[PDB]
Design a protein around this nucleic acid. Sequence first.
DNA 1: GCGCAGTTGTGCTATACAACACACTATTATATACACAGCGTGCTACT
DNA 2: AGTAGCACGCTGTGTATATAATAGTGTGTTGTACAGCACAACTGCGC
Lengths: 45, 92, 56, 87, 56, 231
Amino acid sequence: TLKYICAECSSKLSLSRTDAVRCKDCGHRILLKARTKRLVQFEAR
Amino acid sequence: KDQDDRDHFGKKRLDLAGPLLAQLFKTLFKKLTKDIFRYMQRTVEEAHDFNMKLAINAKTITSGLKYALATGNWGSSRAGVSQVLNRYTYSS
Amino acid sequence: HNGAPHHAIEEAESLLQFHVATYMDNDIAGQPQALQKSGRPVKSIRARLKGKEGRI
Amino acid sequence: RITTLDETVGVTMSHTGMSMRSDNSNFLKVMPKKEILDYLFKLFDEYDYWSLKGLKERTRQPEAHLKECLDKVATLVKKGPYAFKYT
Amino acid sequence: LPHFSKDDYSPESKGFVENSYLRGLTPQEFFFHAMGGREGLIDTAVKTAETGYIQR
Amino acid sequence: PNLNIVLTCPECKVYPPKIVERFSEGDVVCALCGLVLSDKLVDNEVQAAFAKITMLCDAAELPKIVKDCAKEAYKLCHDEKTLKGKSMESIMAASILIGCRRAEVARTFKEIQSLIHVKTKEFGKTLNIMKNILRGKSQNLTYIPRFCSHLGLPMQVTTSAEYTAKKCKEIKEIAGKSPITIAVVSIYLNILLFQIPITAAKVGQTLQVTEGTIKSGYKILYEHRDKLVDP
DNA sequence: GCGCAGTTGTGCTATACAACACACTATTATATACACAGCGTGCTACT
DNA sequence: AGTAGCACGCTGTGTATATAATAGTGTGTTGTACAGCACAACTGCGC
Ligand SMILES: [Zn+2]
Ligand SMILES: [Zn+2]
């Protein structure tokens, strides 16, 4: 499974496939994709 | 007296949302009413059934307005009345 | 072939003539235009040739 | 003015769509053959025009049976005020 | 403009603009100068659109 | 008759085609010798039925996906022998309820019965034959939130009701006597747990369940109050 | 019949009613359940 | 203490299965009868 976030309560979900799309603990159907864990690099230029 | 001026601004009326939606919603509601009447003729002349949900069709009005504001064509008899907002800058 | 009221014939003909007509030219003056199911007027061969951005 | 319904909005929609609630109001809810035939004939002299309904009401027999024998004695007129009645 | 009594033909009224751009313009001046500018944009669009169609 | 075109590298010939296609250059090239393979890549009954069906699903506000599943279904049945009747009212309701099922949406037999008068039992037979045809051409839970809507109940109430339905089905005992009674009773329990009044007659009316039925379900459900508690 | 002076016109503008034929649904039993709606009886409250 | 009203409980009929009987009755289908330029061409009117 893959980790997501709720729209409002910002709770961590990590719902799996074939769970459709909804938050547990509230009805918001807007799920954020929960930013990547691995490191990202920039040049200050 | 001089020839009347066509461009005198006091003689031009502007139409915002209200008058528009008035026009359009008028002709929608006429179409609705007329449809209910047709359903009554069909069921009474054919003596079948009357049930309010079948008699009233919501998407007539609903999808009608939704459509119009999507296309912005009032009819064409009018076009481009609706335009997606410019968020370029708060001034704009 | 059969069952000809001859009022139906004369109409069915006028139908054919109409289709072929708007096939070659959709915009003939005074006649009804052929409207594609979307409500847009059909683009006839003549429309394809006629204006700027036509083939020519 | 116009009044804005303030409810939880769920109840109003439930009534709108299929509600599992119906009706609750009503608007546009919409003698043997020997004596039978003899009696029917006396009606025919008594009435120059009559119906399979009037005959079935009298004879308490299906209109189909009434229509068969009547074809023999009576004839049908389908045009005029008396239309659909045997003379 | 509403700011002038009727039948006033003085050039201030009929649109002479006295002040140079460096000194700035009084409002009823400014408005006029906007009218002139608009004439200048309009005709320019017309001339351009027509002249090309001559060039063709 | 033949007419199928395949792309092959005459210089490679080693494999069948293994190539890449370049859309920007609009050309297609063998990935091996780097040769260009191609260039200049270019960029009456029914209609009446679907009309009235359209009206019905529309008045029902069902999302287009459901509408179109039912349309598809109905096309398959169509004129077939085995159907042998039903006057076009039964088929439209059947196909609808199918498209609801297949769409994972749920609608009660009563609800559709409110859009159309199908006489009931006749409807069941038609629905079963149609179901058989679909197999030949080869779940209450959803109802629980929908009902809350009708009552406008909080989210926690709804999820509580869901836990309640799963727990009740496992514990068996009356097997449910149709799902509808269980869904409504499950709610009635959950709400009575909480302070929010609907009382009883209001839910029996509103949701069209016999008051006696709700109370009867309530006694047995009350007995198992022990194991139904989520926290 | 001919000519002249209005009007038009035409491109472009970066089905209903009646009759006949064909299909059908009413009824009776049996376990099953499960359901829903009404009717009767009992209890409580008010006069 | 008596009467009326309300609530609860129990009994009856829909839902579903098969299966035969056989009507006439109802529904559907088919057949018959009745009811913005600027310049270009026609046409119309007058001589
Ligand atoms: Zn949430
Ligand atoms: Zn190659």
